[PDB]
Amino acid sequence: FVNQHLCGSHLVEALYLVCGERGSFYTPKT
Amino acid sequence: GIVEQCCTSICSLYQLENYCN
């Protein structure tokens, strides 16, 4: 059911939606 | 890696979760 591709922006955001890891963890840029 | 997987391939609810902790 939740088997799609999340590239570009989708992941950086997904984190916020589930467990925000964009602090001093995995807060990368492209 | 953290994103690569859910980008080049597809991932699941848990594959995502890992980030969490």
Coordinates of C-alpha atoms in Angstrom, one line a residue:
Chain A
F1 CA 0.0 0.0 0.0
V2 CA 2.8 2.6 0.8
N3 CA 5.3 1.4 -1.7
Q4 CA 6.1 4.5 -3.9
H5 CA 9.2 6.5 -4.7
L6 CA 10.0 9.6 -2.5
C7 CA 13.0 11.3 -4.0
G8 CA 13.9 15.0 -4.5
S9 CA 11.9 16.4 -1.5
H10 CA 9.5 13.6 -0.4
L11 CA 11.9 12.1 2.2
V12 CA 13.2 15.3 3.9
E13 CA 9.5 16.0 4.5
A14 CA 8.4 12.3 5.3
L15 CA 10.7 12.7 8.3
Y16 CA 8.6 15.6 9.6
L17 CA 5.4 13.6 9.0
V18 CA 6.8 10.6 11.0
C19 CA 9.9 11.4 13.2
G20 CA 11.6 14.7 12.3
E21 CA 15.3 13.9 12.0
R22 CA 16.3 17.3 10.5
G23 CA 17.9 18.8 13.5
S24 CA 21.5 17.8 14.3
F25 CA 21.0 14.4 12.6
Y26 CA 20.1 14.0 8.9
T27 CA 19.5 17.6 7.9
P28 CA 21.1 17.5 4.4
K29 CA 20.7 19.6 1.2
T30 CA 20.9 18.7 -2.5
Chain B
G1 CA 21.4 4.7 2.6
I2 CA 18.8 6.8 4.5
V3 CA 17.3 8.3 1.3
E4 CA 18.9 6.4 -1.6
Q5 CA 16.7 3.4 -0.9
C6 CA 13.3 5.2 -1.0
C7 CA 14.6 7.0 -4.2
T8 CA 16.3 4.6 -6.6
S9 CA 14.0 1.7 -5.4
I10 CA 10.9 1.7 -3.2
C11 CA 10.8 1.4 0.6
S12 CA 8.4 0.6 3.4
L13 CA 6.8 2.2 6.4
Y14 CA 9.7 0.7 8.6
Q15 CA 12.5 1.5 6.1
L16 CA 11.4 5.1 6.8
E17 CA 11.0 4.7 10.6
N18 CA 14.8 3.8 11.0
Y19 CA 15.5 7.5 10.6
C20 CA 13.3 8.2 13.7
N21 CA 15.8 6.6 16.1

